[PDB]
């Protein structure tokens, strides 16, 4: 308010200027006596350019939603307007292609693991969800484009699903049976390349395509990236806290259809609940065959085999790490032994002056003394460390023999079992 005061409309001007001239306004006189001050002095000026130059010249030197990689479960804190997700166009990394190809030829492979203890540190209310996205064509046998608009549930070859295993909830890629997920169209929004999918039973999933920035993988203390990508049996209750859907874009957008799963972060009570129900369902499924031994054993021996396999893998890991530790400590030793040979050559060098107290060399002699005794202590330390590493390495070498005998026994058990 108050803007109207004054504020003339039409053209804008206030009053008469002091002088006429655009660039030549002063008082008077020209023809100069050179005096600098008299009535015949022209300039009538002083302190012309006492200050220094300040950058002479014009001086106009020049002129006046990071996307989450496909297949990498990440936390999205919700808003009132729903979840925020931004996909990319760049095709899914080697990792996920690998996993899904392996899996093509209920079991599954664990992408990530969840830890409420940590997830709450940043999201105390436990409102955050876990979003994951894949390019529809890698999941669906029939491209989503070439699909009736009437279909609400498209068939899928794999899905991203929450499971409860080893006392943690974890997000993982499942497959191997008839599966099928909601198909929903993506209304656009103000932002350019940004739509709103609404999956039944999830929040508003507002997506945003972005193929300008190079894709990123977000890293959150709760969500881990389980290196072990072995195929394991999957939950009977898999998905009990997951909502996924194939989302298609409008024809005049040019955006490929994308699959997205959105899983809840379970609290630890809910995780004990899921584990319990899972154990009850495993109990159920166990028998009902001809007898308990026929099937229960089938299962205990296949699980035991898969575990022995994990044991072998971790043992091999330990042995490849112990081989490097061994070689490293060995070369540290070698190095320190060359340094020792050096210092002891310098002592042979200046030995002459050992009993010559008034020579230059007889300084460098004690100095080489110091050098040698140090390098020797060093060598001793490298020897201790190398011995220790050789011990660890031998232990590992036996660990492998034992673990792979165990794998052989568990694989024979798992054969006998699978025959019965």
């Amino acid at each position: 308010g108050g803007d109207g005061r004054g504020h003339n409309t039409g053209a804008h001007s206030t009053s008469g200027n002091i002088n006429g001239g655009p660039t030549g306004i002063g008082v008077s006189g020209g023809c100069s006596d050179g005096s600098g001050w008299s009535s015949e002095n022209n300039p009538w000026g002083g302190g012309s350019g006492s200050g220094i130059h300040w950058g002479g010249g014009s001086g106009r030197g020049n002129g006046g939603a990071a996307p989450v990689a496909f297949g990498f479960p990440a936390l999205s804190t919700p808003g009132a307007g729903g979840l925020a997700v931004s996909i990319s166009a760049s095709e899914l990394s080697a990792a996920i292609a690998g996993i899904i190809a392996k899996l093509k030829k209920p079991f599954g492979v664990v992408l990530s693991s969840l830890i409420p203890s940590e997830i709450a540190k940043d999201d105390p209310n436990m409102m955050s969800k876990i979003v994951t996205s894949l390019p529809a064509d890698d999941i669906t046998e029939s491209p989503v484009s070439s699909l009736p608009l009437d279909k609400a549930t498209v068939n899928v070859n794999v899905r991203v699903v929450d499971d409860v295993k080893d006392e943690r909830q974890n997000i993982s890629v499942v497959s191997g049976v008839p599966m099928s997920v909601p198909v929903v169209d993506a209304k656009p929004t103000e932002r350019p390349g940004v739509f709103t999918a609404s999956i039944p039973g999830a929040p508003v999933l507002n997506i945003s395509v972005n193929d300008s920035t190079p894709a990123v993988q977000t890293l959150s203390p709760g969500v881990t990236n389980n290196t072990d990508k072995d195929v394991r049996p999957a939950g009977f209750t898999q998905g009990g806290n997951t909502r996924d859907a194939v989302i298609r874009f409008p024809k005049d957008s040019g955006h490929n259809a994308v699959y997205v799963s959105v899983s809840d972060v379970l609290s630890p009570d809910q995780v004990k609940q899921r584990q319990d129900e899972e154990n009850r369902r495993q109990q159920e499924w166990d028998a009902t065959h001809p007898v308990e031994a026929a099937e229960r054993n089938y299962e205990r021996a296949r699980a035991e085999l898969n575990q022995a396999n994990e044991d072998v893998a971790r043992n091999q890991e330990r042995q490849a790490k112990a081989v490097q530790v061994y070689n490293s400590r060995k070369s540290e030793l070698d190095a320190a032994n060359k340094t020792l040979a050096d210092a002891i050559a310098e002592i042979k060098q200046f030995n002459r002056f050992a009993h010559d107290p008034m020579a230059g060399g007889h300084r460098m002699w004690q100095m080489a003394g110091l050098k040698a005794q140090r390098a020797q202590t060093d060598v001793n330390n490298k020897q201790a460390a190398f011995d220790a590493a050789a011990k660890e390495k031998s232990d590992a070498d036996a660990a492998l023999s034992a673990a792979q005998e165990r794998r052989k026994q568990k694989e024979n058990k798992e054969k006998d079992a699978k025959d019965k």
Binding site: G4, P22, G81
Partner: protein, 340 residues
């Protein structure tokens, strides 16, 4: 004040400081204006130079710095450059300027924008023609080439601006305005039309490309009195936000009516009264609704041109059940101003 008026060039540094506060019931979320300290200082410079007897060139710039902000990350919040332009005044044909300046439609909407603090809500900034924007080329005629006294007209072209937000973006536009002042009476009519950018269409609300505004203004100012009445209609031009949906956009149709009546006294006093109303129509999912509907009752003591104090009490008639999360609460503001 004029600090340098030499060499056929004159510079008028004009700046002011305003210790301001807003009061209202509650925290102030629903208050018309807000609540708390709104102190701010503005600085600007105007300059003229008569290149020729019949041709002179002028340049004006203004910036606003807010003092209510803290010294942390929010120091720059609310700090901006309002006006920055230049131009030349020929003897009679008129004058032509370019830069960042008020839109022609603001010329019409100036009559109502006489309130001490509130007022001119419809004249949003960075909007098509109602408020001050950057990238305008304007030609103006005074007294129709000196033919008819008091009747002046202006035309304005608006270069497209592609910004991040539809609220601040625009496209190619055109507009015109005419104002006849006779014997104290004043009449004005302004019209502006432009095309909405693709980003603008992307808004959930709003439909169509031609964003159109136009307005008509009447007034009488003299004898320490000032009456004014501006009626303006627009299509797909006015911004609107929905707190319930937390979604924004533009109004398919809008009618706005503003009325002001202010008296001034010899002893530096100016009581003021203002009625206001704005109704948007054909809103997507909200039908027709009223954006603003309130009375003003306020006053201003003018100690002198350079010192003044003022108060304004806004009786917000908006209801709480309004379908756009608009603030349905009254408000008041008290301000003191120094200006050179």
């Amino acid at each position: 004040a004029e600090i340098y008026n030499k060499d056929g060039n004159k510079v008028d540094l004009y700046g002011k400081a305003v210790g301001l506060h807003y009061f209202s019931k509650g925290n102030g979320e629903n208050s018309y204006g807000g609540n708390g300290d709104m102190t701010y200082a503005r600085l600007g410079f105007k300059g003229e130079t008569q290149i020729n007897s019949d041709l002179t060139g002028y340049g004006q710039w203004e910036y606003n710095f807010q003092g209510n902000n803290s010294e942390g990350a929010d120091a720059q919040t609310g700090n901006k450059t309002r006006l920055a332009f230049a131009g030349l005044k020929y003897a009679d044909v008129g004058s032509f300027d370019y830069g960042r300046n008020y839109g022609v439609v603001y010329d019409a909407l100036g009559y109502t924008d006489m309130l001490p603090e509130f007022g001119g809500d419809t004249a949003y900034s960075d909007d098509f023609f109602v408020g001050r924007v950057g990238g305008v080329a304007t030609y103006r005629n005074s007294n129709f080439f000196g033919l008819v006294d008091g009747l002046n007209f202006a035309v304005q072209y608006l270069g497209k601006n592609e910004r991040d937000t539809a609220r601040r973006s625009n496209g190619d536009g055109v507009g015109g305005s005419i104002s006849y002042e006779y014997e104290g009476f004043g009449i004005v009519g302004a019209y502006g039309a432009a095309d909405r950018t693709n980003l603008q269409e992307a808004q959930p609300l709003g439909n169509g490309k031609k964003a159109e505004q136009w307005a008509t203004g009447l007034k009488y100012d003299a004898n320490n009195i000032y009456l004014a009445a501006n009626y303006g209609e627009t299509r797909n031009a006015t911004p609107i936000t929905n707190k319930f949906t937390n979604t924004s956009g533009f109004a398919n149709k809008t009618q706005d009516v503003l009325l002001v009546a202010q008296y001034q006294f010899d002893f530096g006093l100016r009581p003021s009264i203002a009625y206001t109303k704005s109704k948007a129509k054909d809103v997507e999912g909200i039908g027709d609704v009223d954006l603003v509907n309130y009375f003003e009752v306020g006053a201003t003591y003018y100690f002198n041109k350079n010192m003044s104090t003022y108060v304004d009490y806004i009786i917000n008639q908006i209801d709480s059940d309004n379908k756009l999360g608009v603030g349905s609460d009254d408000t008041v503001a008290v301000g003191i101003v120094y200006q050179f």
